[PDB]
Design a binder for these strands. Structure first.
Lengths: 66, 155, 180, 186, 223, 86, 125
RNA sequence: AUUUCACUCAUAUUAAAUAAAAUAACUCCAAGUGGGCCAUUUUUGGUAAGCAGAACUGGCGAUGAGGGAUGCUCCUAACGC
RNA sequence: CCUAUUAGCUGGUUAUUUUCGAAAGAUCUCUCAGGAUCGCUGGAGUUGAUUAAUAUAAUUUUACCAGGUAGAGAUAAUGAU
RNA sequence: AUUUUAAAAUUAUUUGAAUUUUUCUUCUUAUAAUUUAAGUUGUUUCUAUACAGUACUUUCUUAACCCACUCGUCUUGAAAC
């Protein structure tokens, strides 16, 4: 038989029953498809920083542990 | 039955009266940085990079910048939850948002006020005032302009 | 004092003024005489008329004064002529009516009762303009002209209104409406 | 009538009581509930809360992870509300003082041979009532295989959930919807 | 071994004396303000001048309608004002934000300017206070200044008279006092309403809207 | 603590003074001020009232000017209507 | 209606009866919650067979105690009065229905010399 | 752009107000449901309909109580004894 | 006898109290008396909060955006007249 | 059985001060008490100087005032012709 085609009735209170949830808004976002030749260079920057920090820490550890 | 990309955008995506033509050359000179707020206003003269109908007039943060495009994070309401959407548009359809310009001006002004307040060790209220009830005023007025009002008859 | 007899109409003198802006440093203040149940209602009426006559709303205005006007001689009978503008179910009409009593507020209460009873005009449809005491020689309505004869007297044909205590259900003999 | 959320009753979530009818664990829960009440110690409160948790939320901690977590405090004792399991990948152990619910036999023998010792929570309460020099640790609560099937359904875009399949050959859930050549991928 | 009781008693005695002095100063301030308003009005009348007084900065709001058949915006505003029952009353500080919130709830409330006597009566004979831990409040009638001192003492508000002052004059510690105070659960009016359906400002009998100073008699019949 | 009867903080004197340490002094002052004999006010009523004559004068003047303004507006409106009639 | 005898308050008497049990013999008066769809009693229509609810519960300080202000304890042996030797003032005793006359006499004797009251003291004699 | 060092930007009322805001957030397993209808306001087809089709909110449904004589949906008001 | 064949359909579906508490939208479907899936709901559990504050909000304020509905117009355009 | 405490008030003494200048003026110094603190206590009768009644408790049967439609089910909607 003929059926009710459509209605948005009660949909808003259904939505608000568990509230309108907001996005989590994390601090960091994946850089997978973003600005190549920039984030690759950023990887190089981080590697250089880590290498310098690690070599300095290793020097300190060796000179303090004899 | 008809739900094309630009369905229902007859007036929204039309140029204003006597405001037709391509964008000014100065629009291409505006500076965009990652994470700053931006307004998505569709410019119908540029067809590529055109945002979808929903995002015209919305605001979002930059998450990606390309040579002639920009990716902006916009919250869109989908029934029971808000969800983030990454819309990619050309720089003709995007504009530096002023949603936080009052915030930045307040930041700099309050900084240079607090500096001198701490210098003089004076405790100052820095928050905005939401001013409400006015004080009593002992106001003078000569009787040459206290005019009496009566409801008017019908004509 | 008989609260069953008193009404709740009072006259209020209200002065207001638009908040000064950069356009005009001192706007012209307005003053009104309004009959209302209380000062709050009088101020509401004042702002209604401010918005209707001037382009001044309560949100862009301030109240300089609001005080109740008391009748100087609340025990002297005087005649009042009141102009009035009210809208009916099919149009708007201004009419002039007359009363006589001791207080302008009492005359206004009489006016509201008469308008309700004779034209079914609710108080929300009535605008009172220009109520003023008038001399006996300028009285226009015959039902008041007849009240100003040299010596006025008539019988008391009203039926007695007794207290509840003496308004007893069963009577020994039929009372008389003649009495007097 | 009154317009209140949940008709005005505060709703808590999670365990309220111990489910295990193990008499020794019930005694331990009683003791640490008393300790958490009578002392201000968040240490004791956390231990009392964790003694109540289900099995999946007191996962085992390996000896290697225990020693790695205790590397920077050699003088303090490590408190684990789960079990301590031996790690064959670890070559050598070093002098660990560890309190735990249960120790596997191999882990216990290895710790004793290394010269540290295994403590129960009653001994921990006796010797460190407020948790001085005590580092609370827990194993990986989300490393179990059940969690690998959770989250976004396998079939949602960029979903890492394992599917439920009888076997994982080439002919079991690998054709249409998992590669571009057959309709779509993922 | 007993020095703790002695020092606690001394502290309580000093607190009592401080509250006494503060309350005396409050009474003097009330009288001085009343006299100042009277004489300033006198002077304005003597001159050819208009004296407009300040707005009262604080309003008392009574909910009039029940919990059924209300728009979601109205329900949200009611929750934010802490007006949850059909005869709840609260104090609201007056500013643009609260006034705009009150505007969209106006047909379901009546409010006005409380005056010192009715503020004192409300706090003394219908004043309940949120005593316990945060979000675990446990409504208790005042009956004593101990709980007031414990929660609000860091603002130096130990005392029901201090609460009355901070409420009547929208003092620096107003949000804290108002939030500390449980929503007033008022009785129905002794002589009844006129018509909850209609506005107080309508020429016909009505109740909802801003009653201004006329809220005092309604509170007195409802308290 | 066990809940007890909530004493009326307005009518029960002990708890009222407990809540308001200044109330006993305030009420005593009000009572002694009420206790003043009628003779002083009887002999001072005229002295107090006679000093308000200037206030009464300006007080009549303001209302007189207000009614004069109302009457002037009425007269102006009547004259305008008469002018509109022709 | 409530009945109040000393400290005892019985919030309601005349135990709830099953809906429509008055006019159907196959429906026993033992209370059953009407599940129904349009069942009058379930919807709490005025003037018909109110349903039991937790609000009728008795004050727990005087909940299970008898009109003699004592809790009843049912015994079937003389050996089941030892607990009552220390509770003679707040427990009354009742002899089990299936206890013979000999054991009943022994239990009454022991209760009396224990000054513990017996509810059904004169049964089977 | 990132990293490391500095200095310091109200917090003693809280970078506007108000908030029985953590009664939150998240995860797992699962039920029923997927014929709806009505009222105000807006609105399409129709001469119209207690007709057919939509929008918002509130209800009825799933819900009794006081009132409208009477009445699933109106008004007050939602329910332990 | 296979066979207690099958039935998206009709009927029925058995103690109490207490607590929480819906949907009659949506997408796909040889789909329209059905189903799966989302939404709404319960139970379980953890992380948090328990610090009148932060997260948070069917609310407002302040600042800044976007709109072409009501209205208005026909001499501004188009189409009428 | 280690807050029906402490204080608060009142009474009777007592110290000093203030002041609206006092038979309820206030503020403390000490003592002893009381309750207005610190949720009802007292007196007199009766039951009754009984061992089950004409009283008291209770069950049942009848009235009387007010109220009350047939349950289960499908259904938007069942007391349903």
């Amino acid at each position: 038989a003929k059926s009710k085609n459509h209605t948005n009735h009660n949909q808003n209170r259904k939505a608000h029953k568990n509230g309108i949830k907001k996005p989590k808004k994390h601090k960091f976002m994946s850089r997978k498809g973003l600005d190549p030749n920039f984030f690759r260079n950023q990887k190089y920057c981080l590697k250089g920083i880590q290498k310098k920090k690690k070599e300095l820490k290793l020097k300190a550890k060796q000179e303090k542990n004899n | 039955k008809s739900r094309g990309k630009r369905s229902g955008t007859r007036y929204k995506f039309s140029k204003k009266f006597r405001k037709h033509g391509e964008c000014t050359a100065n629009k291409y000179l505006e500076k965009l940085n990652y994470g700053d707020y931006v307004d998505i206003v569709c410019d119908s003269t540029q067809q590529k990079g055109m945002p979808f109908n929903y995002y015209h007039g919305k605001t979002g943060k930059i998450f990606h910048i390309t040579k002639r495009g920009v990716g902006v994070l916009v919250n869109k309401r989908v029934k029971h939850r808000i969800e983030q959407k990454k819309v990619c548009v050309r720089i003709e359809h995007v504009r530096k948002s002023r949603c936080n310009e009052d915030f930045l001006l307040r930041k700099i002004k309050n900084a240079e006020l607090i500096k001198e307040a701490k210098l003089k060790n004076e405790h100052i209220n820095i928050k905005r005032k939401t001013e409400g009830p006015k004080p009593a005023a002992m106001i003078k007025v000569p009787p040459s302009k206290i005019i009496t009002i009566e409801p008017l008859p019908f004509y | 004092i008989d609260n069953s007899l008193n009404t709740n109409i009072h006259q209020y003198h209200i002065v207001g003024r638009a908040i000064p802006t950069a356009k005009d440093k001192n706007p012209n203040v307005y003053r009104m005489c309004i009959f209302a149940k209380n000062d709050t209602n009088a101020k509401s009426r004042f702002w209604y008329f401010m918005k209707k006559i001037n382009k001044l709303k309560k949100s862009n205005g301030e109240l300089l004064a609001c005080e109740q006007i008391k009748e100087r001689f609340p025990l002297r009978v005087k005649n009042y002529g009141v102009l009035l503008r009210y809208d009916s179910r099919t149009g708007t009409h201004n009419m002039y009516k007359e009363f006589r009593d001791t207080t302008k507020e009492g005359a206004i209460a009489q006016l509201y009762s008469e308008m309700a009873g004779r034209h079914r005009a609710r108080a929300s449809s009535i605008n009172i303009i220009r109520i003023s005491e008038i001399s006996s020689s300028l009285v226009r309505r015959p039902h008041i002209k007849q009240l100003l004869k040299r010596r006025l007297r008539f019988p008391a044909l009203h039926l007695p209104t007794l207290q509840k205590e003496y308004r007893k259900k069963f009577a020994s003999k039929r009372p008389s409406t003649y009495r007097m | 009538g009154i317009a209140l959320k949940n008709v005005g009753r505060i709703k808590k979530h999670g365990r309220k009581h111990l489910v295990s009818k193990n008499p020794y664990l019930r005694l331990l829960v009683k003791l640490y509930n008393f300790l958490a009440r009578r002392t201000n110690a968040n240490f004791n409160k956390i231990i009392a809360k964790r003694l109540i948790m289900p099995k999946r939320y007191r996962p085992p901690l390996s000896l290697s992870k225990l020693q790695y977590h205790m590397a920077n405090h050699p003088n303090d004792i490590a408190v684990v509300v789960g079990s301590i399991t031996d790690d064959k990948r670890l070559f050598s152990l070093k002098q660990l003082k560890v309190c735990a619910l249960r120790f596997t036999e191999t882990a216990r023998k290895r710790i004793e041979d290394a010269g540290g010792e295994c403590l129960t929570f009653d001994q921990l309460a006796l010797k460190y009532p407020t948790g001085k020099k005590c580092v609370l640790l827990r194993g990986p609560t989300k490393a179990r295989t059940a969690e690998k099937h959770f989250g976004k359904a396998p079939g949602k875009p960029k979903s890492k959930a394992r599917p439920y399949v009888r076997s994982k050959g080439r002919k079991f859930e690998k054709a249409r919807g998992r590669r571009k050549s057959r309709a779509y991928k993922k | 071994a007993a020095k703790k009781i002695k020092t606690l008693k001394l502290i309580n005695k000093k607190k009592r004396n401080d509250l006494r002095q503060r309350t005396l100063r409050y009474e003097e301030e009330y009288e001085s303000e009343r006299k100042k308003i009277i004489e300033l009005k006198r002077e304005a009348r003597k001159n050819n001048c208009f004296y407009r007084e300040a707005e009262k900065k604080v309003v008392f709001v009574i909910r009039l309608k029940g919990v059924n058949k209300l728009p979601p915006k109205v329900r949200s505003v009611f929750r934010l004002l802490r007006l949850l029952q059909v005869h709840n009353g609260v104090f609201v500080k007056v500013n643009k934000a609260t006034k705009e919130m009150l505007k969209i709830v106006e047909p379901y409330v009546t409010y006005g300017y409380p005056t010192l006597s009715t503020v004192r009566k409300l706090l003394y004979k219908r004043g309940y206070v949120r005593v316990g831990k945060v979000r675990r409040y446990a409504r208790k009638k005042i009956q004593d200044n101990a709980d007031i001192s414990k929660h609000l003492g860091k603002y130096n508000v130990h005392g029901i008279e201090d609460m009355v002052y901070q409420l009547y004059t929208c003092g620096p510690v107003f949000k804290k006092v108002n939030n500390f105070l449980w929503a007033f659960k008022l009785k129905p009016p002794r002589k009844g309403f006129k018509a909850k359906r209609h506005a107080f400002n309508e020429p016909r009998p009505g109740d909802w809207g801003n009653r201004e100073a006329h809220i005092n008699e309604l509170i007195n019949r409802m308290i | 603590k066990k809940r007890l009867q909530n004493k009326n903080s307005l009518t029960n004197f002990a708890v009222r003074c407990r809540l308001n340490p200044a109330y006993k002094l305030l009420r005593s002052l009000a009572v002694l001020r009420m206790r003043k004999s009628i003779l002083e006010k009887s002999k001072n009523k005229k002295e107090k009232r006679v000093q308000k004559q200037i206030q009464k004068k300006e007080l009549q003047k303001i209302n007189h000017d207000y009614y004069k303004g109302v009457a002037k507006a009425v007269k102006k409106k009547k004259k305008r209507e008469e002018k509109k009639a022709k | 209606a409530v009945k109040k005898v000393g400290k005892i308050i019985k919030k309601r008497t005349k135990k709830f009866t099953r809906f429509q049990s008055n006019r159907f013999m196959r429906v026993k008066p033992a209370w059953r919650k009407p599940r129904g769809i349009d069942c009058r009693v379930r919807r709490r229509y005025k003037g018909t067979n109110l349903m039991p609810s937790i609000g009728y519960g008795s004050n727990k300080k005087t909940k299970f105690l008898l009109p003699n202000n004592k809790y009843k304890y049912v015994v079937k042996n003389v050996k089941e009065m030892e607990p009552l030797i220390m509770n003679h003032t707040k427990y009354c005793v009742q002899i089990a229905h299936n206890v013979s006359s000999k054991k009943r006499k022994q239990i009454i004797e022991r209760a009396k010399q224990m000054n513990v009251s017996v509810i059904n003291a004169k049964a089977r004699l």
